[PDB]
Every structure is written in structure tokens, then in C-alpha cells.
């Protein structure tokens, strides 16, 4: 039982920045990445749902 997107309990880790993380980027930036934007939303929702 391991999950590739599990960052911990989702009510405790949803607004938590990561370890190094001086400045965070945005998850998507037609004008920029599009299928990387859609997979950055699917990976976040898989973290909040646990596989």
C-alpha cells in the first residue's frame, strides 16, 4: 500500500508548500502548457482522493 500521489492526509497537506520551495510556481504556466495543465489537475485530485 503506497500511492504515487499521496502527500499525507489531504486536510493537513493541501495548503502546505513543499520542502525547498522558495517561490512556488503555478501548475500550468494555448499561451502555455495545456496537457501539462490537465495532468497537474488530475495529479492534485488523485492526492485528495487516495488513488
Amino acid at each position: 500500500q503506497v500511492a504515487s500521489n499521496w502527500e499525507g492526509p489531504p486536510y493537513m497537506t493541501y495548503n502546505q508548500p513543499q520542502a525547498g520551495s522558495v517561490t512556488l510556481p503555478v501548475a500550468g504556466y494555448i499561451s502555455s502548457q495545456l496537457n501539462n495543465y490537465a495532468e497537474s489537475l488530475n495529479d492534485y485530485l488523485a492526492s485528495q482522493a487516495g488513488v
Binding site: 486536510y11 493537513m12 495548503n15 502546505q16 508548500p17 522558495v22 517561490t23 512556488l24 510556481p25
Partner: protein, 84 residues
Amino acid sequence: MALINPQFPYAGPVPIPGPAPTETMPLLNYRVEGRIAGIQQARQFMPFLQGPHREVAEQTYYAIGTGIQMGQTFNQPLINTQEG
């Protein structure tokens, strides 16, 4: 291992007065039957304990739990718009 004097030898022992011959003979002392007396108790209220002791004391532990873990309001970083 004495040396015999040839000029003044002597003979063996002659009879002398004696110590009343029955008075050097003892009686054979006649033991009666005996008994370790009383009814013995089975156990004794001892002044010391009969078990082992410990030289040093060791610290014991018991597990405890923490509590319901809550969420937090983090201070959130700024956006990396090429200044960072």
C-alpha cells in the same frame, strides 16, 4: 634404639604393685531410646525475604497517544515570476 651397656646391663621389667584390675575396666554405657520432642511447625515467619533483589533500578515506560491532528493556516510563498 639404645645401646646396650656391657659393663652395667639390666634385665626386663619385674612385677610391681598394680592398680586394682577391675578399676581400669569401664562399663559399656547403656543408651536408652530418644526422641526429637514436639510437633514441628511447617513454616516460619522469616525476618528476611527468600527471593532475589535488584542492584540497580531501571526506568520503565508506558505508551501514550497524542490527539486529533488538525490542519493549519500556512503563510504561503509568492509566485515565481522570475524573482526568486
